[PDB]
Amino acid sequence: KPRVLLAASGSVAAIKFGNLCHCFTEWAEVRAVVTKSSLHFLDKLSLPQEVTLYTDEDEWSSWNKIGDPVLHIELRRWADVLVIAPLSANTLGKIAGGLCDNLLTCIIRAWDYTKPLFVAPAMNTLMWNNPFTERHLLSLDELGITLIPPIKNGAMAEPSLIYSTVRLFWESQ
Amino acid sequence: KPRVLLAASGSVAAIKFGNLCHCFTEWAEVRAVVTKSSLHFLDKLSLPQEVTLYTDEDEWSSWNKIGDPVLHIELRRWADVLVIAPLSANTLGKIAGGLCDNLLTCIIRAWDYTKPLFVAPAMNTLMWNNPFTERHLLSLDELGITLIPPIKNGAMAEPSLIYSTVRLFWESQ
Amino acid sequence: KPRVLLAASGSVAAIKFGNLCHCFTEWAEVRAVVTKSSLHFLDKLSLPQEVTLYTDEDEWSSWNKIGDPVLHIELRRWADVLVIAPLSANTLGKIAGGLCDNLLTCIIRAWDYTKPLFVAPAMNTLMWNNPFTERHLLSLDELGITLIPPIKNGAMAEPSLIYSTVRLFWESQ
Ligand SMILES: Cc1cc2nc3c(=O)[nH]c(=O)nc-3n(C[C@H](O)[C@H](O)[C@H](O)COP(=O)(O)O)c2cc1C
Ligand SMILES: Cc1cc2nc3c(=O)[nH]c(=O)nc-3n(C[C@H](O)[C@H](O)[C@H](O)COP(=O)(O)O)c2cc1C
Ligand SMILES: Cc1cc2nc3c(=O)[nH]c(=O)nc-3n(C[C@H](O)[C@H](O)[C@H](O)COP(=O)(O)O)c2cc1C
């Protein structure tokens, strides 16, 4: 059973993150990662009971002294695939900038692109049409990241599409 | 009467932001946006009484649940022009990076460059002469942003120049 | 006696920062700069008693009103050389992005590359092998920064090597 890491960043579409997790739970073992901002839009009670939710604070529950496991490193090794849905314009920019100041971006900055990484951008039309969207998505493409396009613009792809896109890929490999 | 959005970021020159707003109030309808760091140098009592000042917290006064208006989107649509004076080296870098973690940078990341956007950089000479200044300003130029050059170096352009530069442009269009 | 600014950013290797300072104290006048995250791994009591340690808060102890000295500017002028050991992946990215949101990155964003700046990256192997490492280090190289390579991968270079590398350079100039 594939290990799928699902992540949410600060887009209003994170309100659908619980449902997205539900779409993956039967087929895969699911763990969730959220940014602080995503918590403004996500209700934890909407998530499957079996899914462990990790936040920035969890980095310090795992590590306390030298030698201990570093959570972003353990999740990166554990995952067969990472799906960021929603991917906010800010996190999109931080990924393109190679920055890492929280659990999600640390996992990504430690990423080995031999492993599949999918993103479902979700942002207002004005940010979607702004020039940095095409610039950063182009950079993510070069890295090997797979874009699950928003719905026409910038609204997050539907959970069912995110799920079937990842499932079809896995079964083909 | 043109709608002018005036913004201040974390430079000591933000102490002059109130006066800058005063220069624009008769000619335009003015709204102000400040970053958290700019508040170290700006005195709110120096602003025109008629000017509404928006901060990061205001994003949450406008939005509470799905469907509500998102402040950075409403200000971006409302504005005929955006003027950032002072523009700090940090915000300059975030703009060039397509990042958005506060009200000001969210407005900019949602910007449609068909609308004029002027910047008045303000930083110590050492930061002004540092290589990233020319690199980021070059990127802003390509986007279509209009630079109001600092005074010789890196001291913010005088409010009167910022004002006449924006006014002359508007009247020509 | 050369003025050496030693800095630590958020890597576990910062636990060795006190010892690194000790390596430099006899030969140079040493001042230390730390990021907030580095404080998770550094024990202040491990530092030489004679070394003043500066943090982000110190920026506000030095400056209170217009005209006062700005600490990152004073340290940049004071230093003959800057050594960042450890350099985290995040600070590496912020340097390459020309960003400055804390004392360390403000000093760097104000840097005049005629003065030597050495970096000793320290990060988990997964981050070291990630594509942004080579990309950002390449950018730092172009600026004139001198890389003191990690030990095979990504573990920080030993303090003795960091010290002799800086000392040999100085004595040659
Ligand atoms: C009410 C509101 C709704 C937002 N909606 C979105 C959105 O749909 N997509 C997006 O990319 N950013 C959106 N933003 C801006 C992000 O929340 C902001 O850039 C944030 O810093 C991103 O944090 P993160 O990327 O670390 O999760 C919104 C902001 C607010 C206040
Ligand atoms: C006392 C002091 C004065 C500063 N003056 C300036 C300045 O004139 N210009 C600048 O670009 N940054 C200056 N900085 C650094 C910025 O305040 C810092 O990069 C900040 O993170 C920028 O925040 P913002 O861009 O989100 O407003 C100063 C810092 C301090 C502590
Ligand atoms: C327990 C733990 C250990 C970490 N070890 C490292 C490390 O060795 N190198 C690194 O580059 N980042 C490491 N990180 C991630 C950084 O601490 C993180 O990117 C941080 O935001 C960097 O802050 P700074 O660059 O402003 O100091 C670690 C994180 C945690 C929670």
Coordinates of N, CA and C in Angstrom, one line a residue, chain A residues 6 11 16 20 22 25-26 32-33 40 54 56 58 71-72 77 90 93 108 111 127 135-136 146 152 173:
Chain A
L6 N 0.0 14.1 2.0 CA -0.9 15.1 1.5 C -0.6 16.4 2.2
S11 N -4.4 28.4 1.2 CA -5.4 28.9 0.2 C -6.8 28.6 0.8
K16 N -11.3 22.1 1.7 CA -11.6 20.8 1.1 C -10.5 19.7 1.4
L20 N -10.2 15.6 0.5 CA -9.1 15.1 -0.3 C -8.4 13.9 0.4
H22 N -9.8 11.9 2.5 CA -10.8 10.7 2.4 C -10.6 10.0 1.1
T25 N -7.5 7.6 1.5 CA -7.3 6.6 2.5 C -7.6 5.1 2.3
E26 N -8.5 4.8 1.4 CA -8.7 3.4 1.1 C -7.5 2.8 0.3
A32 N -0.8 13.7 6.7 CA -1.0 15.0 6.3 C -0.1 16.1 6.9
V33 N 0.3 17.0 6.1 CA 1.2 18.1 6.6 C 0.5 19.5 6.3
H40 N -6.2 28.4 8.9 CA -7.2 29.4 8.9 C -8.4 28.9 8.1
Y54 N 0.4 16.5 10.8 CA 1.6 17.1 11.3 C 1.7 18.6 11.0
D56 N 4.0 22.5 12.1 CA 5.4 22.9 12.4 C 5.8 22.5 13.8
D58 N 5.2 19.9 15.5 CA 5.6 18.5 15.5 C 7.1 18.3 15.2
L71 N 11.8 15.3 11.9 CA 10.5 15.0 11.3 C 10.4 15.2 9.7
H72 N 10.9 16.4 9.3 CA 10.8 16.6 7.8 C 11.6 15.6 7.0
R77 N 11.5 10.5 3.7 CA 12.0 9.2 3.4 C 10.8 8.2 3.4
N90 N 2.1 31.8 -2.3 CA 3.3 32.0 -1.4 C 4.2 30.8 -1.3
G93 N 6.0 30.2 -4.5 CA 7.2 31.0 -4.6 C 8.3 30.5 -3.7
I108 N 10.0 19.7 1.3 CA 10.2 20.0 -0.2 C 11.7 20.3 -0.5
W111 N 13.6 17.3 -0.8 CA 13.1 16.3 -1.8 C 14.1 15.8 -2.8
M127 N -4.2 36.5 -8.8 CA -2.8 35.9 -8.6 C -2.5 34.9 -9.6
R135 N 5.9 31.9 -14.2 CA 7.3 31.8 -14.0 C 7.7 30.7 -13.0
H136 N 7.0 30.7 -11.8 CA 7.3 29.7 -10.8 C 6.8 28.3 -11.3
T146 N 4.7 17.6 -10.9 CA 3.6 17.5 -11.8 C 2.5 18.4 -11.4
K152 N -10.9 26.7 -14.5 CA -11.2 28.0 -15.1 C -12.7 28.2 -14.9
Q173 N 3.4 2.9 -13.0 CA 4.8 2.7 -12.6 C 4.9 1.5 -11.7

